[PDB]
Amino acid sequence: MKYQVKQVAEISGVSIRTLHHYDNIELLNPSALTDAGYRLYSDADLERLQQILFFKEIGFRLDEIKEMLDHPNFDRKAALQSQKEILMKKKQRMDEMIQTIDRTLLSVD
């Protein structure tokens, strides 16, 4: 029924420290707590975690992920594209950086 850090960390691949941090940030708040304070996660919490984890792969930030999960109305298409555009530019920057390196490695190679 419920899961505690060790298990959630194992099922999802993230660290316990991560679960805490996501808890402190209000990104992912456990569904329950034991009298002793132990965090107890529900299957729903696990879906939520998978989604925040997926948006993480696309390069979004915890705040963006948060605002998108807490506010579903927020159009996702435009976000997925803009994020793409942002990514593409980051890629373009690195290219210019690599050129600068090559354009520099031409001297006693």
Next chain:
Amino acid sequence: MKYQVKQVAEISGVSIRTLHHYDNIELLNPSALTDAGYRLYSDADLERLQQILFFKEIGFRLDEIKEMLDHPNFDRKAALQSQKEILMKKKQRMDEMIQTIDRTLLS
């Protein structure tokens, strides 16, 4: 032939705040200090600042840049390559992420 922050900053493009930081980090230390504490950079300090800015463009971090300027024995060739390689892998990760977005935009 000495310059104070306003100038050096204006001549190099970086901010005065940057110059201070680079000073605290021991990356770029002013050639001279004024009695009142104003720092004065020499033409040499300016060359050093340019070198710094180059490596900064290639993507190196202050520590790496520092360690390279303070020890000119460090083979620069391999450094420029390894850095190139690192930049490439980053490019690749960027690609996979873009693919994943596209692979999701099918709707």
Next chain:
DNA sequence: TTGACCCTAACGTTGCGTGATTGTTT
């Protein structure tokens, strides 16, 4: 009692931006 497991601090990391407050004078 004892592992195995959980918690809360709180500093470390990268590179300055942005005030706030205050001294100096190229």
Next chain:
DNA sequence: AAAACAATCACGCAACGTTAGGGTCA
């Protein structure tokens, strides 16, 4: 006697990693 310019704090940002010390018991 003011306008510019310089200085030293020190908090803020992204996302956890990593001890350090100390309860709990699925």
